[PDB]
Design a protein around this ligand. Structure first.
Ligand SMILES: C#CCNC(=O)[C@@H](Cc1ccccc1)NC(=O)C[C@H](O)[C@H](Cc1ccccc1)NC(=O)[C@@H](NC(=O)c1ccccn1)C(C)C
Lengths: 99, 99
């Protein structure tokens, strides 16, 4: 799709057998989702850095469907005010900024 | 331009007679720049909302050139870790997300 930016670019995703919504965020390096039970291995990771850090669980090579595009990438699971698809997964789906 | 997202989408801008760099951030509603002297009227605005708010100066209808595209939009001037071009100015330059 071509998504204009008059509203927040919120898309539907499928992850961990769940349907969720997330924001396509070119300002975010990483993808951070709340409340997903993913199977397989993880390691803790500190993100943010303003006011302290936030600890999340880093799962590598997670299958995720974004707006119908099935890809694989690192998903950080932990507290976040909004589910965010970061550049790491936008590259996988071939998403570009165009003007 | 078509901008892939393997690196941070940092672009050159011209604002208030100065060259600056800023991040194209589809996760940001508003454009927030640090250290620009803009002429004409402003009003204070509270932004963020996590840990407290940050106060910035809101300047409406500011001429700004972004990656060579001359547009007009609201620019918030105040503290920010990164100069950010938000959706408000990405709409003006006709920037879309495409995949
Ligand atoms: C007004 C305003 C700017 N941002 C906001 O209010 C936040 C709130 C939010 C947090 C998580 C998910 C969705 C939304 N929204 C964003 O989309 C974040 C923004 O796209 C990006 C993503 C990011 C996060 C951490 C470090 C570096 C970059 N930017 C930022 O968050 C900004 N800097 C930060 O230091 C920061 C750190 C931790 C939380 C919030 N902010 C700077 C770039 C100015």
């Amino acid at each position: 799709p071509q998504i204009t930016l008059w509203q927040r670019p919120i898309v539907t995703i499928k992850i961990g057998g769940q349907l969720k919504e997330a924001l396509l965020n070119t300002g975010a390096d990483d993808t951070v989702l709340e409340e997903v039970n993913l199977p397989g291995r993880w390691k803790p990771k500190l993100i943010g850095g303003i006011g302290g850090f936030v600890k999340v669980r880093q799962y590598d090579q997670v299958p995720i469907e974004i707006c119908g595009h099935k890809v694989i990438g690192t998903v950080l699971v932990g507290p976040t005010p909004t589910n965010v698809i970061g550049r790491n997964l936008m590259t996988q789906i071939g998403c570009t900024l165009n003007f």
